[PDB]
Ligand binder design. Sequence first.
Ligand SMILES: Nc1ncnc2c1ncn2[C@@H]1O[C@H](COP(=O)(O)OP(=O)(O)OP(O)(O)=S)[C@@H](O)[C@H]1O
Ligand SMILES: [Mg+2]
Lengths: 164, 327
Amino acid sequence: FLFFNLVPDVNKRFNVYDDALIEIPDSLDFSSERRKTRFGRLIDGTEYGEMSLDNQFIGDSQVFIEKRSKDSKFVFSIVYNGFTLGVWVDVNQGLMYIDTAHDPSTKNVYTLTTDDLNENMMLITNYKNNYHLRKLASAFMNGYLRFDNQVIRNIAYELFRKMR
Amino acid sequence: SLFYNPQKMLSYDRILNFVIGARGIGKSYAMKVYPINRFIKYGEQFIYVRRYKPELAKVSNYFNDVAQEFPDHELVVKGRRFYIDGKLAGWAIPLSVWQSEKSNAYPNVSTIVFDEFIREKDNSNYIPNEVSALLNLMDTVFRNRERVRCICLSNAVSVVNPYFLFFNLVPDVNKRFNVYDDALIEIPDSLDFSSERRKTRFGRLIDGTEYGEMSLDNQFIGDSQVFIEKRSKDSKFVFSIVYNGFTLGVWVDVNQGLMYIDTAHDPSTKNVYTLTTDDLNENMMLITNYKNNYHLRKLASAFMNGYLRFDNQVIRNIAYELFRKMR
RNA sequence: GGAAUGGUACGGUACUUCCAUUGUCAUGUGUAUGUUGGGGAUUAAACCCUGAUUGAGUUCAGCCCACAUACUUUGUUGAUUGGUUGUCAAUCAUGGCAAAAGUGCACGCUACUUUCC
Ligand SMILES: Nc1ncnc2c1ncn2[C@@H]1O[C@H](COP(=O)(O)OP(=O)(O)OP(O)(O)=S)[C@@H](O)[C@H]1O
Ligand SMILES: [Mg+2]
C-alpha cells in the first residue's frame, strides 16, 4: 500500500478504482466470530480485555489542525522552497490565517533562504523581520494563527521551527 | 530451605502464574521437572518457545538434570523432538516462525515450560509488541479453559518493563505474594533467601562477597529502580506541562516547601505549557528553550536544589527524560 | 489413575470490622485574644534580646496546635448588565452512608499440588 498509495474507507466494504479494489471481509461476523471464542475461555476474555488486541483495530497517524479561510482584507506574502504562502487578516475578532493567495501587486515578498532568490524578494533578517511581523509572531504563540490544510500545516511548522 | 520449591506456586493456582528470580538457581529445575511429572501421570505434551534459533542446536540435553529427580522411566530426545518412553513430549521451536505453526492442530498442552522470558538490559533480542505475540501463542495453544497453566520468569525484579505496569504488576519486598485477578508477584522465602545466600557465603568466599555486592543481591531480591526520594501531599494545582501527550501537573506546598509532581486535573484553562509543537493546539501556549527556566522558575530552581520531589516511577522516568530534553 | 479428611486459589456464605476500595451526600481564605485543653519546649545550665509585671530580678513568660466571634476569596473557569455582588460547574481534600475489609467456609469438588488408596 505504501507503494500504490491507496485511500480506502472503513464504510465502503468494496473499494473499487480503475485498477484496484480493497475489500474488507465479513466485518461484523468476524468480530462476532471472535466474540464467541472468549466464551470458550474466560482467560481469553482477559486477553481480549488487553488493550493490545483492541488497539490493532485502531489506526494512528498524524492529523490536521485547522481548516479555515476568511472573506476580508489581507496583507503579507511569503515564499519558501519554491512554494508561496499568503497571509490573511480579519478585523472581526482580528483573526489571522495563512492560505494560498498570490498578489500581483506583490509587496514585501519574503524567503528565509536565498535558494529562492529573485530581484523582487529580499533575504529576510533572521529575527528583525520577525518583529516586523510581530502580529504573525504573536499569532503563532497564541491561537490566532489558523490554516486550511495539513500540508500547509507541515510547511508552516517547519518554517516556524527554522524561525525562532 | 534447600532448592527452588514450586509448591506454593502450584497451590494458589492461577490459571497463569507469574514468578521471578533465582537466576539459574533452580528457577528452571522444578519447572522442567513438572512436565515430565505430568507425563508420568500421563497427561499432555508441552510447548517450548525459544528466543532465537542458534539457542536450539545445543539444548537437546534438557532432561539431564531431571533424571536425578525421576531415574525410573525413559527420558530421552530423538533429535529436535523430546521423547518420554518414546512418546512425544515437547513441541520445541524458537519465535521466528510461530505464525506458520498456528494453523496446525495443537490439541494437547500441559504447562508453560520456558524461562528467561525477558532478560535484563536485553531488547535487541526483543520483538515489537511481543506481549501480543504471547497472546497469539496462548490462543494457538488454547482449546478450552483447561489443560494450560502459564508462568513468566525473569531473572531479576524490575518495575519498568511494559508487561508489569501494563498489568500494574507491583512488587512487595515485605510480603512474598502480591495477588490480583490472575497475576501473582512472588519470590522464594526470605528465610529461604537467608539459608541459600548463607550457603553461598559458605564455600567460595569470593563468591560470597560478590553476593555482598548489590550486583548479585539485586538478581534475586530485586530491589531496583527506586532511586529518587518520592512523596505526595495535598497542595494546590498550579502548573501543568503538556509533554509528548501527558497531562503532567505540579503541586507546590509552601509549608515544608517542596514540589510534588503528582498527576491531577483542575479546569485551569491557563498556565498549561507545551515544549513541543505536536502537543500544541489552539488553546495552550508554546515555550522556547529558556523561558521554561523563567516561567517554571520554581521548577528550575527546585530541580537544581533538592527541593523537587516525585510521586511515581513512570512520572520519574518521563520527567528525567524531559529534564534531558530541556537543555 | 480414587480422597478433597494438608496447607490450599477463588466464588458468595456467614462471624468479627476499618467509606483505605467505587459511588451518595453535606464541608473549606485570611488576625485577635483566651491554657481552649494538653503536651513546660524541659541541657540542667551560663549569659543576653524582647513583653507585662513593682519601689526594685521582684516576679513570671516567649512553642505549637482546633474552637468563639468581626475584619474574607469553598479555588475557578465560564452566563450576566455600562461595570461590580448572586444565582448554574469543575477538581482539591475532609467527614457520614452504602459497597467494601479482615476472621471460619460449617455453602463447592470450578480446582492445582498432597501423602496414602
Ligand atoms: N529439586 C531440586 N533438586 C536438586 N537441585 C535443585 C532442585 N531445584 C533446584 N535445584 C538447583 O537448580 C540447579 C539447576 O536449576 P536451573 O534449571 O539451572 O534453574 P535456572 O534458574 O533456570 O537456571 P538456568 O538459566 O535455567 S540453567 C541445580 O544445579 C540445583 O542446584
Ligand atoms: Mg531455566
